[PDB]
Amino acid sequence: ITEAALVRDILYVFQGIDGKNIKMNNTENCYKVERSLRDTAVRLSELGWLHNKIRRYTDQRSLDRSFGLVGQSFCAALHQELREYYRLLSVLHSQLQSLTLRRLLVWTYDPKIRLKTLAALVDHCQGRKGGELASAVHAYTKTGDPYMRSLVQHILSLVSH
């Protein structure tokens, strides 16, 4: 098979919908190709497996108005982050007339960290509101990574308004 069809598939398994020759069969597992190419695909599809959790939670709590205003604010911040992911995917769609570098392994790397942190936060703040929720976000600025501190500190400024 040519590589470009696989690029087409992996650009959609970011959303959490399987490709044509890449499908996920166990829910705990990640998207598997159905030989070196098969080994390469999984690290890229990790971002979509992380994406499903964050998307499902900010979809659910935003429609919940018994949850309270605080945290609908959390969903606001999370939603504004997800919009930028979609901006990236659109640029990647449009740039077709290789063109990908290591099948975009070098590209997806910088979203991977800002996906890992937001994937942690939602279960660290699960079932909370108000100052109880706010303290668990203030926990995440005891970190010493500059990019992660920068990622957290604007979300906190939004949610505690």
């Binding site: 990640c30 030989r35 070196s36 080994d39 390469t40 999984v42 690290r43 990790e46 290789s98 570098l101 290591r102 392994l105 070098v106 790397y109 890992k116 994937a119 942690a120 279960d123 660290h124 668990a136 926990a139 995440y140 005891k142 970190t143 010493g144 990574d145 500059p146 990019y147 992660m148």
Partner: protein, 358 residues
């Protein structure tokens, strides 16, 4: 593999008992450890029976995958995902001239595989802010490696790459990855965190002055890791306040204003209340190790009486090897602090009339 799950809880317990209202401190969820594709290092016909000028292009292509951690299809990385070790199995049939050089190109892959696990492990909360920042600065050079291998892939795509050229290209990155891998082994091996992994990095930063190829790598990693510690220092010096979320700081606060009030039989404020810690000294402030405590303690025992907080000039300080500017700044602030406390003592609630009436 299993061993990482141990270390974090042992490190976390010290801050869990150290914190007396800081309950349920943050840890990463389980799928960060379950999923193995978060590290970079986790057709099939034998290439050896091919002609030479087919073999060279094919081997370059496979090794190019092996560099960024994923396996080839003619060479396999043997299963050793635990410690900083990683092993490789080269194809059992090959031209010996090629195969020797292939073995020679292999060490930078092990000094990549060790490097990538370290960045995952010591960025989590249990490892502390300085260990986070050091990981954040070696990750930049890992990203730099990902940048280089794509250009190699582009040159190979135009059919102009062979094994001698590849060996020549990988020689500059081999030394860099070597310095990073030795430093990573040293940091985990002493199991050091906080200010002890400023002492390790201080000695490692001084260690090269003859090469200066490796001195800049470690010196940049030291600047990045010294960033959080110096901020906590500026908090302590210029007003009075330490928090120490994950232990990185020499001063600790042991309360004793519980037994009796506004008398001291020990002079505990000036003595065993605010004490120093020997092992969180970053091994170039050992000369200033008492003055750094006294400077910030003097301010708390005058902000308690009702006097206004003052600092001479607020400055931000960096690590500099050979010519310290931070030390001389600390000296001026320390003299100003002692002057302010003595000024307050000798004018209001004065010692002169006390000594006279005794």
């Amino acid at each position: 593999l299993q061993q990482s799950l141990e270390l974090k809880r042992k490190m976390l317990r010290d801050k869990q008992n150290k914190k007396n209202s800081g309950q349920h401190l943050p840890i990463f969820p389980a799928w960060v450890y379950e999923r193995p594709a978060l590290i970079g290092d986790f057709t099939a016909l034998p290439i050896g029976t091919l002609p030479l000028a087919s073999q060279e292009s094919a081997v370059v292509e496979d090794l190019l995958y092996v560099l960024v951690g994923v396996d080839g299809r003619y060479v396999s990385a043997q299963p050793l995902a635990g410690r900083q070790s990683r092993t490789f199995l080269v194809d059992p049939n090959l031209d010996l001239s090629i195969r020797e050089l292939v073995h020679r190109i292999l060490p930078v892959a092990a000094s990549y595989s060790a490097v990538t696990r370290f960045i995952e492990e010591k960025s989590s909360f249990e490892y502390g802010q300085v260990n986070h920042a050091l990981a954040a600065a070696m990750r930049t050079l890992v990203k730099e490696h990902l940048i280089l291998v794509s250009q190699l892939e582009q040159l190979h795509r135009q059919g102009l790459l062979s094994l001698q050229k590849l060996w020549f290209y990988i020689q500059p990155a081999m030394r860099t990855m070597d310095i990073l891998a030795s430093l990573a082994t040293s940091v985990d091996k002493g199991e050091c965190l906080g200010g002890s992994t400023l002492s390790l990095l201080h000695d490692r930063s001084f260690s090269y002055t003859g090469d200066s190829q490796a001195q800049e790598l470690c010196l940049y990693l030291t600047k990045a890791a010294s960033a959080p510690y110096f901020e906590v220092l500026e908090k302590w010096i210029y007003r009075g306040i330490i928090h120490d979320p994950y232990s990185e700081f020499m001063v600790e606060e042991h309360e004793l204003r519980k037994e009796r009030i506004q008398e001291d039989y020990n002079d505990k404020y000036w003595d065993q209340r605010y004490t120093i810690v020997q092992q969180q000294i970053p091994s170039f402030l050992q000369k200033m190790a008492d003055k750094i405590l006294s400077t910030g303690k003097y301010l708390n025992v005058v902000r308690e009486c009702g006097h206004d907080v003052t600092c001479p000039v607020a400055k931000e300080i960096i690590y500099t090897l050979k010519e310290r500017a931070y030390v001389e700044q600390i000296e001026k602030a320390f003299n100003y602090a002692s002057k302010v406390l003595l000024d307050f003592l000798m004018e209001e609630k004065e010692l002169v009339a006390h000594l006279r009436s005794i």
